[PDB]
Curated annotation (Swiss-Prot):
Component of the large ribosomal subunit. Residues 1-25 have a biased composition (Basic residues). Residues 1-33 are annotated as: Disordered. Component of the large ribosomal subunit. The ribosome is a large ribonucleoprotein complex responsible for the synthesis of proteins in the cell. It comes from Mus musculus (Mouse). It is found in: Cytoplasm. This is Large ribosomal subunit protein eL29. Belongs to the eukaryotic ribosomal protein eL29 family. The modification Phosphoserine is found at residue 30. The modification N6-acetyllysine is found at residue 32. The modification N6-methyllysine is found at residue 4.
Length: 68
RNA sequence: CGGCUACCCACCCGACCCGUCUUGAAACACGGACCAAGGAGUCUAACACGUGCGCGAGUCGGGGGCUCGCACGAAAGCCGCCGUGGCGCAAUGAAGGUGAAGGCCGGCGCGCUCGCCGGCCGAGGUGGGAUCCCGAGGCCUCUCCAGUCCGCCGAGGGGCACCACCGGCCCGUCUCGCCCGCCGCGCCGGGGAGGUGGAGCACGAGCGCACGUGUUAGGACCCGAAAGAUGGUGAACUAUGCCUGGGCAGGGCGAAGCCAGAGGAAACUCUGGUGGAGGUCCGUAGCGGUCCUGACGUGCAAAUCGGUCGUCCGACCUGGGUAUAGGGGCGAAAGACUAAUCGAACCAUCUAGUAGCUGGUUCCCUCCGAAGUUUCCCUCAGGAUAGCUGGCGCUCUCGCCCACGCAGUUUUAUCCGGUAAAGCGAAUGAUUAGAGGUCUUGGGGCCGAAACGAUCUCAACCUAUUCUCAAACUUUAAAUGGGUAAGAAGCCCGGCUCGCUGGCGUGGAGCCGGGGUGGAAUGCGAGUGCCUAGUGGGCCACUUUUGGUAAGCAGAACUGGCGCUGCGGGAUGAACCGAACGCCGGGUUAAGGCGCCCGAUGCCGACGCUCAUCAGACCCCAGAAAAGGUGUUGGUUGAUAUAGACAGCAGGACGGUGGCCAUGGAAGUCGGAAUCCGCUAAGGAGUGUGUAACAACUCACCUGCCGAAUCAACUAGCCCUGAAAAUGGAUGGCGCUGGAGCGUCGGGCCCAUACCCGGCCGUCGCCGGCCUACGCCGCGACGAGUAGGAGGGCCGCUGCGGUGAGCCUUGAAGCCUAGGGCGCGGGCCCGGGUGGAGCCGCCGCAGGUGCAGAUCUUGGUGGUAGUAGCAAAUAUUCAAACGAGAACUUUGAAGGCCGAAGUGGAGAAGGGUUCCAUGUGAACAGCAGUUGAACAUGGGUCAGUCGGUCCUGAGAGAUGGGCG
RNA sequence: GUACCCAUAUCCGCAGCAGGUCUCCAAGGUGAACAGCCUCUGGCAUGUUGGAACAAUGUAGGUAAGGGAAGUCGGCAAGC
RNA sequence: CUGUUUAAUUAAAACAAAGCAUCGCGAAGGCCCGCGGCGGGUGUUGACGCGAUGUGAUUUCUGCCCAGUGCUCUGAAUGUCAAAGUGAAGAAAUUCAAUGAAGCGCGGGUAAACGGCGGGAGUAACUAUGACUCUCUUAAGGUAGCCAAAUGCCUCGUCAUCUAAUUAGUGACGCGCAUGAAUGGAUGAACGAGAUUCCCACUGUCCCUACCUACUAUCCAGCGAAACCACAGCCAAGGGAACGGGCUUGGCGGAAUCAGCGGGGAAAGAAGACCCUGUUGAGCUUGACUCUAGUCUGGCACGGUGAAGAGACAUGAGAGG
RNA sequence: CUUCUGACCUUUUGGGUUUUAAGCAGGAGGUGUCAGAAAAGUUACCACAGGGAUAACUGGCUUGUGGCGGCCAAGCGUUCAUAGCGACGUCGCUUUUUGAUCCUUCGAUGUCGGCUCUUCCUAUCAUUGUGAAGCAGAAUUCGCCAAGCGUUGGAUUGUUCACCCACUAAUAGGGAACGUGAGCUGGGUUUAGACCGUCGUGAGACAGGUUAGUUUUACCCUACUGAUGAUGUGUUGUUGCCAUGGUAAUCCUGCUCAGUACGAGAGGAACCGCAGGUUCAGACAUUUGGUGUAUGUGCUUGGCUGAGGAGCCAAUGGGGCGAAGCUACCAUCUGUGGGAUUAUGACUGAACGCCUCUAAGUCAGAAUCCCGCCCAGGCGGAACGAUACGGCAGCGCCGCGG
């Protein structure tokens, strides 16, 4: 009882009925697969930022506000 | 007079018989003779999602108890120190076990890749984010003054839910090291910084009840097996033993034994009788069944009958009793018989056994609407997964010089590739021929004792060319096609963090802060979550292609179509050409067509081709080739002709030379090579016929007459030959020839459910109004559809709780009806006629709720059809009586059959009143009946000496005892 | 217990079914004979119906001139 | 040979038969029944008997192979080998070791047990074929017989007879795909409701059909079904699920009927006995898988007393390398 | 599941130690049907649910193969390509062979061959009319229009096929579901019994061979054959036409021609005419033969009526003859012509000064076509006769008014 083996007929119609839209592009996609050393350095820079940010950046903001 | 309709008839057009398996159904595929009733997705437990309700970090009394005995009460009410308990509120490890709060500010110890302290609120930050808040600005009678009065908005802020990311916390692990504590200073505990695994935490949402869908276990939508197990019943048929009885006409052959006679010296032999044996022969009764493959073959018969057969003293046939009973018995063995069933009986139960397999599966309308494909499976007639589909939503966006976002598309930049084509005087592999050079090699000829001492040639090698090819070759290389980008998620500027890297404040990432959106065209509203049926056999077509000679063959790529689909043309039709579908009126048209079927050329239509004794007449499509035509109609390349051709008529057609090679003959004429010469006006060492050769005819050539065009080869349009198949017959038919054929066209005309305008119905979107708000309006765009998914029903059936101060013996339900009428529809209302005691509307509730099929179950009725059939065994007739009725009864007579192995007289088994008498004649008797073995009534079986009872036979059987 | 059928009509086979079912008695003629045929004692209406005709086909039965198996797979049937 | 056989498609060459052979058994036995018992059949039996097989009148013949598969017999010389029993290590569970019943393995016998019986090369004064000989193989290479057979593919083999003509029949030939010796081979009087060939007489089997008789069939009187039925029935061509009756184009088309007929209705009788699928069954067989009755051995109790003897363990002592 | 490796790890259940076991992580022991069950064969004694998703029939698509043709022309043909063949190449038709695919058929289409019978096809074996030869005659070979008429009797085989004998003008090829099984036959294939050979340990298998092996139903519709009828002409009858459909004739022998034409001989025709015969068709019974139940007559076996005489019975007792009727190629009679034309041969005659059967026009022309003869006569019509007593009637024609 030989039958049909494999065809791709009437497949593009099934695909285009729902759509072949591109994947959802969003900001801050992901951080997976990134170098572990680079990720560790980024975490350290993010967690040590508020130590010196809230003072020197505030002083510079006051200075630029006095400038303009 | 008006009247649609469930009345009948006629014409015009269209019209194949329904249901399901299938790519394909009206099929010469299956089911259906018809009608009435019954008939198929239910219920329980569990799970998932969605919706309604109540409570809410809680929720739930379903389990019990309490009040008072109760028709409604197997209800309802309550427990409150009955919440035991289930679910959720805490997760992570196999386990010992552990087990979730961040942020700001300042200080100190080296504010150290650095802990602690003190104060506060208290679940971080970034980019989006409905909504809300603030808000420059301008919008209302003459004016500076105002609170309401008119009234939107640039920009900015805190930001629900939700989305993405970063960080934070908990549990199990791996690396690194250091610190703290002691009910006891230890292979005792606790803590940190980094990478990972968790169904986690990071202000919680679950619980209980009901409904709908989907999956699953229950017989589980309905009907259906071959089979398996348990426990019992059959030897009245048949197979076999045993016991006890019965039966087998007549003839033929002539075994042993016996007697007599004859022959012989003896042994002995021979002859004629008698004798009556045989698993003997012909043959009857009996027992079986060879052939006619005879008759029947819905029969006499679920195995028979007529001839013809084999055996008939036996291994014979047969009655009764008795023993063996189902994986068993019995078997002169055919797996035959075992109660019409035997390669494993019957009966009841498990059992509604299972089926990936057939068949069926019941009311209407509206909306949406496929797949035969990927992967896996002992998978290929199936299932799971993905995909296609539907439903429920949810989050936002427009609606009062500018949008977020998207696209089977184009435009601009940008790469990617190795097909089509082309090439091999370019790589690789195949490949024909020529030209030159030869270093060498091999085969021939030459000078000559031989010799790379010399020479000619061939093969081989090299060089520059040359002809033809590669899906598994390629320098080069298309079209088509694939990806990306065309902004605010971007750019410029400044400053902080890094434990990453490092000459360097170097590089790179992260964060913060203020300033500047108009960035290719066109079109469009987008995003997202959950549940989910069906599908998982396909087919066809333009083009590209694999195997095959080819196929209406098998297998692929894109797109379209059928299946899932009607309509107008192709006469006919699955795929072709147009075109897609609510009900209508008008106009137009696509494809196609205008001689009649059949609507339209019935145009004073145009140009040209074509004649068939087989014309021709429209993609798929239903017919044909190589080749040929002095049949016509066009074209090309050429050659001749007033220095008079081509055709026709007439004349010449000679000499060297009967030339050289041949020979039985070649003297132009069978052959090989050649092939000239001289006078001429021209004659060819000769185009053909003929002779064995010579002769003869004739031709090339020249000339005489006529007199102006002609000859030859190819090429392509119609037509013709090529062209033969079986029932009579297919441009669709009739037919058509100044066309109704072929080619090129013009102006009109014909009609589709297509287009435009308008009415009506429904869906969707936008909405409008403070008029059943679940109602009433307005505008616009769309309506097909199998499998399947949803919504509505004031469609229908049954019963229950309310309600209609409901209808009815002045007529309920039901049934019938050329009557009226409503709704698109399921259906319903009224009138009339039967009928004689119940029924219905509205609001909710629960179903054993809708039939056209299932070789569906039961019951009834048709065509067949007053048909087949009342024919195995020789045969009936006359008169009379009883009777309404005579062929079937009775009596008499005549003619016949069974003819003693009977169609007679008696019995055993079996039947049980069938035996007898009387009486009726609807039923029985296959017609009839006065008749009967039918019906009703009443009678009938008399035993010491007929048999049972008595006795044992094969055999069955209790106690003693044994086993269980 | 004692009737009756004991059967092509009282049994079984779905029935008044050419089927099946165990025994006794059994004459005369022809003839070897209980073969076949014809009669007597004893039974019967021809087997679930009759009338009219004698077409084809059919079911059983018998002949056919000349040939004699030449038909057929086979001398099947029929025939001697 | 007589006889029996598939009731209801077979009557036979099949089965059976006397005869001829072989196997087991001396009763605490052989072959079987049985859930059970020292229960039952043979057995009211005892080797001229019982039980289990093969071949199949009489005569003559019974060839060669034990390699394999089966059957049987032997020695605790000899390998494998379960429970139970013994010793050792360990606190014990446990582990190790010594020995080891049947069976298997080894060896012998048996083929009237199942079965089998090959293949090359050189050699005769016409040549070939071939008297004769060498060689591989395993256990032995078809002996005596018989044949194109009921056994032969080539084949309708070749020759002779039978015929006018023969794929038939008979006789003979014989590297015979693939005959053959109790798998029985060769004959063979009588008898086959056995199959086949020829001949004589015979006849309607036929040339070549015709006629006659009885019962139907036929019409009528009376009585009266069933099978089947989607609706129903005139054809040609085309398309179509590729062979229509209904569709399209044409040919055409008057009621109701009787007697035959068998071309059609792809006629009826039955969910194809043929082929395939089923993760559907049943019968049967075996060196398919897993089990079991039964059967053969070993151990444990029933199961008790005496004597003699062998092997090992522990004990003290004397020889040895 | 087993084994190994590591923690100076976890649990070994009332609490401790130890053996052991379980537990975590990763390496190995395998699913070759490789996303992974543990698995021999036969059933012809077979069964069930299904499949035309899937073979054995036919039909359908193509024709490789088979058969049948055409073109080119190297050559055969003594000479000479094409009288007759024609290689190397190449182009077509057919489904009378086989093969390829599986489209309809699995709730069945009865599947070989033979017998009987009808029709059709032509790629013609013979017959009618013709052309060409290496056609002197005869016998032959190649084509043209041509299917009207024939294409037999047997030996062996189941056979399709094939071979042989004989006859004949010739013994040609096919189709219709490989025509035809509710027509037959069952010889083989293809069930169940059994035998032999080979294969298999076995059950069993063999497109190997040999034997015996149930052949069911029509009464329905149509078609066909025949018979009543129906429609319309007012009724009925007689005499008549045919529109239409069917269609029948075919072949051979002997004699005169003629031992002639022809041919050197050997050999050896043809036209007209005369006798017939084969097959087929229509009938017919005087003669001949069949049948026979006038149960006509006369013998004869057994029994029966007492015996003669007369008879009867024995499923028409047998047999010798036989009227009438039916019947036989087993006897007898008969079977017939006109037209237009095909193939072909010709006339006049241009295209194309000539030629030419053609281009327009003419001629002859046949088993083929049609009709004539014959068969039945239509939802076809004509010509003629009679047309309703009896007592009241009834029915026609003319003229009529309502
Ligand atoms: Mg598939
Ligand atoms: Mg239905
Ligand atoms: Mg199916
Ligand atoms: Mg199909
Ligand atoms: Mg259908
Ligand atoms: Mg059908
Ligand atoms: Mg059918
Ligand atoms: Mg039916
Ligand atoms: Mg109903
Ligand atoms: Mg609690
Ligand atoms: Mg069942
Ligand atoms: Mg089982
Ligand atoms: Mg039992
Ligand atoms: Mg008995
Ligand atoms: Mg005898
Ligand atoms: Mg004899
Ligand atoms: Mg007899
Ligand atoms: Mg019989
Ligand atoms: Mg019998
Ligand atoms: Mg027989
Ligand atoms: Mg018969
Ligand atoms: Mg009959
Ligand atoms: Mg007899
Ligand atoms: Mg005899
Ligand atoms: Mg006898
Ligand atoms: Mg059993
Ligand atoms: Mg039986
Ligand atoms: Mg059983
Ligand atoms: Mg069920
Ligand atoms: Mg599949
Ligand atoms: Mg979706
Ligand atoms: Mg490529
Ligand atoms: Mg290329
Ligand atoms: Mg296919
Ligand atoms: Mg295809
Ligand atoms: Mg479908
Ligand atoms: Mg669609
Ligand atoms: Mg469509
Ligand atoms: Mg159409
Ligand atoms: Mg197009
Ligand atoms: Mg289109
Ligand atoms: Mg319109
Ligand atoms: Mg048009
Ligand atoms: Mg018109
Ligand atoms: Mg043509
Ligand atoms: Mg067409
Ligand atoms: Mg076609
Ligand atoms: Mg031309
Ligand atoms: Mg025509
Ligand atoms: Mg529309
Ligand atoms: Mg719709
Ligand atoms: Mg109601
Ligand atoms: Mg009343
Ligand atoms: Mg009442
Ligand atoms: Mg119901
Ligand atoms: Mg119904
Ligand atoms: Mg039914
Ligand atoms: Mg009733
Ligand atoms: Mg009826
Ligand atoms: Mg009748
Ligand atoms: Mg009868
Ligand atoms: Mg009277
Ligand atoms: Mg009487
Ligand atoms: Mg008498
Ligand atoms: Mg007697
Ligand atoms: Mg008697
Ligand atoms: Mg009475
Ligand atoms: Mg009666
Ligand atoms: Mg009585
Ligand atoms: Mg009574
Ligand atoms: Mg007395
Ligand atoms: Mg007594
Ligand atoms: Mg007892
Ligand atoms: Mg006791
Ligand atoms: Mg009595
Ligand atoms: Mg009887
Ligand atoms: Mg009887
Ligand atoms: Mg006598
Ligand atoms: Mg006498
Ligand atoms: Mg009578
Ligand atoms: Mg009777
Ligand atoms: Mg005769
Ligand atoms: Mg005679
Ligand atoms: Mg004779
Ligand atoms: Mg003879
Ligand atoms: Mg024969
Ligand atoms: Mg006979
Ligand atoms: Mg017997
Ligand atoms: Mg028989
Ligand atoms: Mg014993
Ligand atoms: Mg013997
Ligand atoms: Mg031997
Ligand atoms: Mg041995
Ligand atoms: Mg032990
Ligand atoms: Mg020699
Ligand atoms: Mg030999
Ligand atoms: Mg012999
Ligand atoms: Mg013969
Ligand atoms: Mg052998
Ligand atoms: Mg041999
Ligand atoms: Mg005679
Ligand atoms: Mg037709
Ligand atoms: Mg056909
Ligand atoms: Mg057709
Ligand atoms: Mg039909
Ligand atoms: Mg119609
Ligand atoms: Mg139609
Ligand atoms: Mg009739
Ligand atoms: Mg008939
Ligand atoms: Mg079936
Ligand atoms: Mg499967
Ligand atoms: Mg079975
Ligand atoms: Mg796999
Ligand atoms: Mg099996
Ligand atoms: Mg058998
Ligand atoms: Mg198919
Ligand atoms: Mg087929
Ligand atoms: Mg049938
Ligand atoms: Mg049929
Ligand atoms: Mg003819
Ligand atoms: Mg046929
Ligand atoms: Mg046979
Ligand atoms: Mg057989
Ligand atoms: Mg002469
Ligand atoms: Mg002469
Ligand atoms: Mg005749
Ligand atoms: Mg006569
Ligand atoms: Mg006569
Ligand atoms: Mg007489
Ligand atoms: Mg007499
Ligand atoms: Mg007398
Ligand atoms: Mg008699
Ligand atoms: Mg007579
Ligand atoms: Mg006579
Ligand atoms: Mg005649
Ligand atoms: Mg002519």
């Amino acid at each position: 009882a030989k039958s049909k083996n494999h065809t791709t007929h009437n497949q593009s119609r099934k695909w285009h009925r729902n759509g072949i839209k591109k994947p959802r592009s969003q900001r801050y996609e992901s951080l997976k697969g990134v170098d572990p050393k680079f990720l560790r350095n980024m975490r350290f820079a993010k967690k040590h930022n508020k130590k010196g940010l809230k003072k020197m950046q505030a002083n510079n903001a006051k200075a630029v506000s006095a400038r303009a």
